[PDB]
Amino acid sequence: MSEKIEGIIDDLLNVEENADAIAIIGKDGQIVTQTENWNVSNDLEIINELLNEKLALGEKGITSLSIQGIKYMIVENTEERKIGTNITGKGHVLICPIPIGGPGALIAYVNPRAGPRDLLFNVQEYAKKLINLI
Amino acid sequence: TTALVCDNGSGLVKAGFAGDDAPRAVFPSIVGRPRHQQKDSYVGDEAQSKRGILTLKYPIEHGIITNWDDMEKIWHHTFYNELRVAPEEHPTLLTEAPLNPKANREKMTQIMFETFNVPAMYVAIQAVLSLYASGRTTGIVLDSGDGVTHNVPIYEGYALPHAIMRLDLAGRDLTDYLMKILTERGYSFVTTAEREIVRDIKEKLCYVALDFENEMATAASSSSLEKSYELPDGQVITIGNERFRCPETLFQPSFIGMESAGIHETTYNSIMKCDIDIRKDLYANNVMSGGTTMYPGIADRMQKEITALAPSTMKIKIIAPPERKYSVWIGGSILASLSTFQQMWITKQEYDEAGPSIVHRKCF
Numbered sequence A: 001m002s003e004k005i006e007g008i009i010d011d012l013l014n015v016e017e018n019a020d021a022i023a024i025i026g027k028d029g030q031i032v033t034q035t036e037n038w039n040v041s042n043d044l045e046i047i048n049e050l051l052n053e054k055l056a057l058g059e060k061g062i063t064s065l066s067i068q069g070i071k072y073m074i075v076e077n078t079e080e081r082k083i084g085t086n087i088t089g090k091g092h093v094l095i096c097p098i099p100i101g102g103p104g105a106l107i108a109y110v111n112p113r114a115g116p117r118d119l120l121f122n123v124q125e126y127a128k129k130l131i132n133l134i
Numbered sequence B: 001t002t003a004l005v006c007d008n009g010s011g012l013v014k015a016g017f018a019g020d021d022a023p024r025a026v027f028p029s030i031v032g033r034p035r036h037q038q039k040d041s042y043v044g045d046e047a048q049s050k051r052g053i054l055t056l057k058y059p060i061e062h063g064i065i066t067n068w069d070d071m072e073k074i075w076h077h078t079f080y081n082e083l084r085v086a087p088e089e090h091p092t093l094l095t096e097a098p099l100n101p102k103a104n105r106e107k108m109t110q111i112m113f114e115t116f117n118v119p120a121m122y123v124a125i126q127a128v129l130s131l132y133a134s135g136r137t138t139g140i141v142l143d144s145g146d147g148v149t150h151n152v153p154i155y156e157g158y159a160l161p162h163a164i165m166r167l168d169l170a171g172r173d174l175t176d177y178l179m180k181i182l183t184e185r186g187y188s189f190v191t192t193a194e195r196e197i198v199r200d201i202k203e204k205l206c207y208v209a210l211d212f213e214n215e216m217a218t219a220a221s222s223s224s225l226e227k228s229y230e231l232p233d234g235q236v237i238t239i240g241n242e243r244f245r246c247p248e249t250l251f252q253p254s255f256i257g258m259e260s261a262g263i264h265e266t267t268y269n270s271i272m273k274c275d276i277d278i279r280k281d282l283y284a285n286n287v288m289s290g291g292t293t294m295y296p297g298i299a300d301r302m303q304k305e306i307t308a309l310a311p312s313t314m315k316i317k318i319i320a321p322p323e324r325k326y327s328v329w330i331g332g333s334i335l336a337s338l339s340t341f342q343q344m345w346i347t348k349q350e351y352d353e354a355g356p357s358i359v360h361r362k363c364f
């Protein structure tokens, strides 16, 4: 969308070499931008389902989600960060809402060599940086 | 160079050196202060030795640190009197409950770096270390000690936080309940001291019946399930169905007026809160840890009960290691002495930068 958003994406991929692909989702649920090596278009419905999920006492949450044909089990879910990990070694996904608990998201697809949570401090920080810019 | 491992339970501290097979020191998690005002406080075995001229407190309730001044004495006593080390010379691995509030995790971290000046530290979830002690990284742990019982499903070394079940029913409640039902028989246990005797009766002669109703028949038809026991004064008492009615409380918490479903059903509940794609792994890797899981027959009872709740062809395996009173400590010993773990420690340089909230970044 802007040069400052692309600068955030460029910076994230420079600082975290196990980050393989990035997608940013806007306040309106749509793709602001994403890296050329993947397209999350067809998966926006389950992604936006997860982002707007607010459980009442007895409700079971989404435990699994598919993005570009990779199935990710949810292993962490707060308003700040949500982690999906593929159980057959095909990588992980970090989904950080923008703002915290909001409809936007910074999404980082992670290489299966990394532990998903290791990229989390940086990714969380760049989601904070994106609040102004979407 | 040699790391320390301290496992702080509601009842018992387990402390030692990373890379050892067993805790060097196991002692009661209590601080005693003089009844009149020889020292200003006492910890552990010594507090117990002198119980009668002190007032005893438990700093940890249901696995959570609530008396931070008393906890600091326990930690000081551990470093200086039990392990005989200078804490500034040793990375220290600590343990915590599942769903330990964030402010507690920080306060533990703050105290270790600022009061004890440790060069490095780490905190891990207890159940997660038990799983690590059985050589597995995926599984569901039933962890039941003195103050608290959890079901903890774990995938590849990390608890699934949405799926953890806590139940405020554990060994101290079972001792109190066993005290309550020996009154039916005629006997009388009420004091702190009498309670300890009943703890020892519980530990020696209790067991989990495979079928509770078949066991109640066999006990009240004859005396082949009765055992004798000798009190410190000399009186020889006889107990029958109290042997298995006491730990039946775990599987039927309404025995002590509690509303929860039993440990078997909370296991199922926790498994079902997880994704179907790891359920086979969860059912096949059911690890019991903690002192309250030591009752004879509890693995076989749990095997039966989960089999009745699970899909009919699901493969179910209960792993009850002999050493499971100390599995949590053992897990920490193995974790902390590993070569690959030496990047994982929160260093004092890291703490000075980011303050106590560093623990959230580095310890999950």
Ligand SMILES: Nc1ncnc2c1ncn2[C@@H]1O[C@H](COP(=O)(O)OP(=O)(O)OP(=O)(O)O)[C@@H](O)[C@H]1O
Binding pocket: B008, B009, B010, B011, B012, B013, B062, B063, B144, B145, B146, B147, B148, B149, B170, B171, B172, B199, B202, B203, B204, B289, B290, B291, B292, B293, B294, B295, B325
């Ligand atoms: N052989 C046994 N049979 C039954 N119960 C036992 C046995 N041995 C120990 N216990 C009980 O286990 C409890 C101690 O277990 P453990 O040291 O694992 O708990 P803890 O870590 O102190 O407490 P928590 O984990 O709840 O904070 C005591 O209540 C004790 O009576």
Ligand SMILES: C/C1=C/C(=O)O[C@@H]2C[C@@H](CC[C@H](C)/C=C\CC1)O[C@@](O)([C@@H]1CSC(=O)N1)C2
Binding pocket: B010, B011, B012, B028, B029, B030, B048, B146, B171, B172, B173, B175, B176, B195, B196, B199
């Ligand atoms: C041998 C032993 C076992 C234990 O598990 O000890 C812990 C800690 C202990 C502290 C008070 C006690 C008087 C001191 C020492 C007993 C320590 O309280 C317990 O016995 C409590 C009270 S009865 C019971 O079941 N749990 C458990």
Ligand SMILES: [Ca+2]
Binding pocket: B008, B009, B010, B126, B145, B290, B328
């Ligand atoms: Ca414990």
